[PDB]
Scaffold this active site. Structure first.
Site, PDB file in Angstrom:
ATOM      1  N   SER A 159      53.471  32.123  63.556  1.00 53.86           N
ATOM      2  CA  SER A 159      52.372  33.017  63.976  1.00 53.86           C
ATOM      3  C   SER A 159      52.499  33.588  65.369  1.00 53.86           C
ATOM      4  O   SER A 159      51.670  34.420  65.764  1.00 53.86           O
ATOM      5  CB  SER A 159      50.986  32.348  63.841  1.00 53.86           C
ATOM      6  OG  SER A 159      50.700  32.153  62.482  1.00 53.86           O
TER       7      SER A 159
ATOM      8  N   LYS B 245      52.331  37.253  65.476  1.00 50.73           N
ATOM      9  CA  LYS B 245      51.081  38.014  65.375  1.00 50.73           C
ATOM     10  C   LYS B 245      50.857  38.846  66.629  1.00 50.73           C
ATOM     11  O   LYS B 245      50.201  39.889  66.576  1.00 50.73           O
ATOM     12  CB  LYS B 245      49.902  37.064  65.075  1.00 50.73           C
ATOM     13  CG  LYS B 245      49.970  36.473  63.684  1.00 50.73           C
ATOM     14  CD  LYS B 245      48.853  35.415  63.415  1.00 50.73           C
ATOM     15  CE  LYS B 245      48.880  34.937  61.945  1.00 50.73           C
ATOM     16  NZ  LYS B 245      48.686  33.469  61.799  1.00 50.73           N
TER      17      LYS B 245
ATOM     18  N   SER C 283      44.217  32.890  64.536  1.00 55.13           N
ATOM     19  CA  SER C 283      45.437  32.752  63.730  1.00 55.13           C
ATOM     20  C   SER C 283      45.203  32.967  62.236  1.00 55.13           C
ATOM     21  O   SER C 283      45.854  32.347  61.372  1.00 55.13           O
ATOM     22  CB  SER C 283      46.134  31.408  63.981  1.00 55.13           C
ATOM     23  OG  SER C 283      47.575  31.632  63.920  1.00 55.13           O
TER      24      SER C 283
ATOM     25  N   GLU D  33      52.439  37.169  55.449  1.00 57.69           N
ATOM     26  CA  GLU D  33      51.910  35.822  55.356  1.00 57.69           C
ATOM     27  C   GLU D  33      51.632  35.489  53.909  1.00 57.69           C
ATOM     28  O   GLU D  33      51.155  36.353  53.160  1.00 57.69           O
ATOM     29  CB  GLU D  33      50.566  35.709  56.084  1.00 57.69           C
ATOM     30  CG  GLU D  33      50.678  36.066  57.529  1.00 57.69           C
ATOM     31  CD  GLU D  33      51.368  34.991  58.365  1.00 57.69           C
ATOM     32  OE1 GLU D  33      51.486  35.225  59.608  1.00 57.69           O
ATOM     33  OE2 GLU D  33      51.730  33.933  57.798  1.00 57.69           O
TER      34      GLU D  33
ATOM     35  N   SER E 201      52.986  27.733  63.710  1.00 61.54           N
ATOM     36  CA  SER E 201      53.565  26.587  63.019  1.00 61.54           C
ATOM     37  C   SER E 201      53.973  26.913  61.589  1.00 61.54           C
ATOM     38  O   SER E 201      53.552  27.900  61.001  1.00 61.54           O
ATOM     39  CB  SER E 201      52.689  25.323  63.037  1.00 61.54           C
ATOM     40  OG  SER E 201      51.479  25.530  62.304  1.00 61.54           O
TER      41      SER E 201
HETATM   42  O1  LIG Z   1      50.940  29.696  56.941  1.00 62.79           O
HETATM   43  C1  LIG Z   1      51.257  28.545  57.258  1.00 62.79           C
HETATM   44  N1  LIG Z   1      50.646  27.850  58.209  1.00 62.79           N
HETATM   45  C2  LIG Z   1      49.859  28.472  59.201  1.00 62.79           C
HETATM   46  C3  LIG Z   1      48.902  29.413  58.812  1.00 62.79           C
HETATM   47  C4  LIG Z   1      48.096  30.044  59.768  1.00 62.79           C
HETATM   48  C5  LIG Z   1      48.178  29.751  61.131  1.00 62.79           C
HETATM   49  C6  LIG Z   1      49.110  28.789  61.532  1.00 62.79           C
HETATM   50  C7  LIG Z   1      49.211  28.498  62.890  1.00 62.79           C
HETATM   51  N2  LIG Z   1      48.543  29.088  63.877  1.00 62.79           N
HETATM   52  N3  LIG Z   1      48.865  28.508  65.103  1.00 62.79           N
HETATM   53  N4  LIG Z   1      49.772  27.550  64.825  1.00 62.79           N
HETATM   54  N5  LIG Z   1      49.938  27.554  63.470  1.00 62.79           N
HETATM   55  C8  LIG Z   1      49.938  28.179  60.570  1.00 62.79           C
HETATM   56  C9  LIG Z   1      52.395  27.870  56.532  1.00 62.79           C
HETATM   57  C10 LIG Z   1      52.729  26.543  56.847  1.00 62.79           C
HETATM   58  C11 LIG Z   1      53.769  25.902  56.187  1.00 62.79           C
HETATM   59  C12 LIG Z   1      54.515  26.611  55.215  1.00 62.79           C
HETATM   60  C13 LIG Z   1      54.183  27.927  54.925  1.00 62.79           C
HETATM   61 BR1  LIG Z   1      55.181  28.885  53.653  1.00 62.79          BR
HETATM   62  C14 LIG Z   1      53.122  28.565  55.573  1.00 62.79           C
HETATM   63  O1  LIG Z   2      46.184  19.314  60.376  1.00 60.27           O
HETATM   64  C1  LIG Z   2      45.395  18.592  60.964  1.00 60.27           C
HETATM   65  N1  LIG Z   2      44.946  18.784  62.191  1.00 60.27           N
HETATM   66  C2  LIG Z   2      45.306  19.764  63.053  1.00 60.27           C
HETATM   67  C3  LIG Z   2      44.315  20.230  63.903  1.00 60.27           C
HETATM   68  C4  LIG Z   2      44.601  21.221  64.824  1.00 60.27           C
HETATM   69  C5  LIG Z   2      45.884  21.745  64.911  1.00 60.27           C
HETATM   70  C6  LIG Z   2      46.889  21.284  64.070  1.00 60.27           C
HETATM   71  C7  LIG Z   2      48.164  21.831  64.195  1.00 60.27           C
HETATM   72  N2  LIG Z   2      48.529  22.801  65.077  1.00 60.27           N
HETATM   73  N3  LIG Z   2      49.911  23.115  64.920  1.00 60.27           N
HETATM   74  N4  LIG Z   2      50.345  22.296  63.892  1.00 60.27           N
HETATM   75  N5  LIG Z   2      49.260  21.503  63.458  1.00 60.27           N
HETATM   76  C8  LIG Z   2      46.598  20.279  63.137  1.00 60.27           C
HETATM   77  C9  LIG Z   2      44.879  17.398  60.245  1.00 60.27           C
HETATM   78  C10 LIG Z   2      43.979  16.524  60.848  1.00 60.27           C
HETATM   79  C11 LIG Z   2      43.519  15.421  60.137  1.00 60.27           C
HETATM   80  C12 LIG Z   2      43.971  15.212  58.838  1.00 60.27           C
HETATM   81  C13 LIG Z   2      44.870  16.107  58.265  1.00 60.27           C
HETATM   82 BR1  LIG Z   2      45.515  15.885  56.517  1.00 60.27          BR
HETATM   83  C14 LIG Z   2      45.332  17.202  58.959  1.00 60.27           C
HETATM   84  O1  LIG Z   3      46.421  26.607  58.607  1.00 54.76           O
HETATM   85  C1  LIG Z   3      47.235  25.885  59.163  1.00 54.76           C
HETATM   86  N1  LIG Z   3      48.137  25.190  58.495  1.00 54.76           N
HETATM   87  C2  LIG Z   3      48.389  25.319  57.176  1.00 54.76           C
HETATM   88  C3  LIG Z   3      47.649  26.177  56.363  1.00 54.76           C
HETATM   89  C4  LIG Z   3      47.959  26.228  55.012  1.00 54.76           C
HETATM   90  C5  LIG Z   3      48.979  25.442  54.482  1.00 54.76           C
HETATM   91  C6  LIG Z   3      49.714  24.587  55.306  1.00 54.76           C
HETATM   92  C7  LIG Z   3      50.743  23.788  54.813  1.00 54.76           C
HETATM   93  N2  LIG Z   3      51.161  23.728  53.528  1.00 54.76           N
HETATM   94  N3  LIG Z   3      52.220  22.804  53.433  1.00 54.76           N
HETATM   95  N4  LIG Z   3      52.431  22.303  54.722  1.00 54.76           N
HETATM   96  N5  LIG Z   3      51.492  22.942  55.558  1.00 54.76           N
HETATM   97  C8  LIG Z   3      49.410  24.533  56.658  1.00 54.76           C
HETATM   98  C9  LIG Z   3      47.233  25.789  60.654  1.00 54.76           C
HETATM   99  C10 LIG Z   3      48.141  24.961  61.313  1.00 54.76           C
HETATM  100  C11 LIG Z   3      48.089  24.904  62.709  1.00 54.76           C
HETATM  101  C12 LIG Z   3      47.146  25.650  63.432  1.00 54.76           C
HETATM  102  C13 LIG Z   3      46.266  26.488  62.758  1.00 54.76           C
HETATM  103 BR1  LIG Z   3      45.000  27.548  63.680  1.00 54.76          BR
HETATM  104  C14 LIG Z   3      46.292  26.548  61.371  1.00 54.76           C
END
Ligand SMILES: O=C(Nc1cccc(-c2nnn[nH]2)c1)c1cccc(Br)c1
Ligand SMILES: O=C(Nc1cccc(-c2nnn[nH]2)c1)c1cccc(Br)c1
Ligand SMILES: O=C(Nc1cccc(-c2nnn[nH]2)c1)c1cccc(Br)c1
Ligand SMILES: O=C(Nc1cccc(-c2nnn[nH]2)c1)c1cccc(Br)c1
Ligand SMILES: O=C(Nc1cccc(-c2nnn[nH]2)c1)c1cccc(Br)c1
Ligand SMILES: O=C(Nc1cccc(-c2nnn[nH]2)c1)c1cccc(Br)c1
EC number: 3.5.2.6
Length: 260
Positions: free
Chosen positions: A42, A45, A102, A138, A209
């Site tokens: 992201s 973005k 995000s 996305e 991420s």
């Molecule tokens: O969209 C994803 N995660 C996601 C979505 C929206 C925001 C973020 C995010 N924002 N800031 N850090 N992560 C991550 C995601 C994660 C794992 C595999 C695949 Br394919 C897609």
């Molecule tokens: O994804 C989580 N928390 C979280 C919160 C804020 C940011 C992120 C994050 N940011 N970048 N990658 N992960 C993850 C989370 C917390 C408790 C249980 C489970 Br299952 C998932």
């Molecule tokens: O939406 C998130 N993570 C996300 C969403 C949907 C799917 C997945 C995913 N799928 N498999 N592993 N991660 C992760 C995300 C992670 C970090 C920060 C923020 Br803001 C949002």
């Protein structure tokens, strides 16, 4: 010292770490794997939102244009867009949603506004970034598969680009100011680069991420009494299901700040 410290952090983390700092006080840089490609996730973005800001320079009403949000448009993370399904969001709202929350549906609308991922890449090329490439929408642009060139850039390129967009002349002054205000209003960044900086300092950032434990952040930073810094921290791990490591980005930023 700083290079050795970042190498030590990387080795203990078990992943691959990419860092680029630009200190605008004197154009000094610090690069760690600065010319290796990393999945942007992201952090891309920023480039999409900046491209729409550029378009708004010649269409002064563009940011007020409504865009339909249909049920089928929702993807996997839609904290703002889900509130507007069967309604509309303006391009300003979609920009703020993508940057500050995000929101992935919002990012898709930005990409569509630009005619697809290639239009975001075209904007990057137009501002002198020969490295950035956006290939997918996305959510799949976050697959982060090792070796895959899709949706990647290098730390050096991204730091240079973030500087041009936020502190330089890539955008008009109004648009630059809007981008900065958006980044400074980010909600998702307190655990990443900014966790490693003195609390006196001010910053804006964009996190990312994905799979492979990929954990990224790009930031523009205003240190107490110093010219601004631009800092990119990219991190990715060898297993597809690895956990996020925002702490490693905070550690990298702390090494950088203590090295100033
Ligand atoms: O969209 C994803 N995660 C996601 C979505 C929206 C925001 C973020 C995010 N924002 N800031 N850090 N992560 C991550 C995601 C994660 C794992 C595999 C695949 Br394919 C897609
Ligand atoms: O994804 C989580 N928390 C979280 C919160 C804020 C940011 C992120 C994050 N940011 N970048 N990658 N992960 C993850 C989370 C917390 C408790 C249980 C489970 Br299952 C998932
Ligand atoms: O939406 C998130 N993570 C996300 C969403 C949907 C799917 C997945 C995913 N799928 N498999 N592993 N991660 C992760 C995300 C992670 C970090 C920060 C923020 Br803001 C949002
Ligand atoms: O201003 C732009 N492009 C522009 C103008 C003049 C010269 C060039 C250029 N020269 N070499 N690569 N681009 C680009 C532009 C391009 C793509 C998307 C968006 Br949003 C804006
Ligand atoms: O085979 C791949 N991709 C792929 C995925 C889905 C379908 C196909 C496909 N269908 N017909 N021929 N290839 C290929 C692949 C291999 C190594 C790294 C990466 Br990134 C992708
Ligand atoms: O070099 C820059 N700005 C700048 C402004 C004023 C003076 C100088 C300068 N003077 N002597 N060497 N550089 C540089 C600059 C600004 C935004 C993005 C990028 Br990439 C570079």
């Amino acid at each position: 010292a700083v290079q050795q410290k970042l190498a030590a952090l990387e080795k203990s983390s078990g992943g691959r770490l990419g860092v680029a700092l630009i200190d605008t006080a004197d154009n000094t840089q610090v690069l760690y794997r600065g010319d290796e490609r990393f999945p942007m996730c992201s952090t891309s973005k920023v480039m999409a939102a900046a491209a729409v800001l550029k378009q708004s320079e010649t269409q002064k009403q563009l940011l007020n244009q409504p865009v339909e949000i249909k049920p089928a448009d929702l993807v996997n993370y839609n904290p703002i867009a889900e509130k507007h399904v069967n309604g509309t969001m303006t391009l300003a709202e979609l920009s703020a949603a993508a940057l500050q929350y995000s929101d992935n549906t919002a990012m898709n609308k930005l990409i569509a506004q630009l005619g697809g991922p290639g239009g975001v890449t075209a904007f990057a090329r137009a501002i002198g970034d020969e490295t950035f490439r956006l290939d997918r929408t996305e959510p799949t642009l976050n697959t982060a598969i090792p070796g895959d060139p899709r949706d990647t850039t290098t730390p050096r390129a991204m730091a240079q680009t973030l500087r041009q967009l936020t502190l330089g002349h890539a955008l008009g002054e109004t648009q630059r100011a809007q981008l900065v205000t958006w980044l400074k209003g980010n909600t998702t960044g307190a655990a990443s680069i900014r966790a490693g900086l003195p609390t006196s300092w001010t910053a804006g950032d964009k996190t990312g991420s994905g799979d492979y434990g990929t954990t990224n952040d790009i930031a523009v930073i205003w240190p107490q009494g110093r010219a601004p810094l631009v800092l990119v921290t990219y991190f990715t791990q060898p297993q597809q299901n690895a956990e996020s490591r925002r702490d490693v980005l905070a550690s990298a930023a702390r090494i950088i700040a203590e090295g100033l």
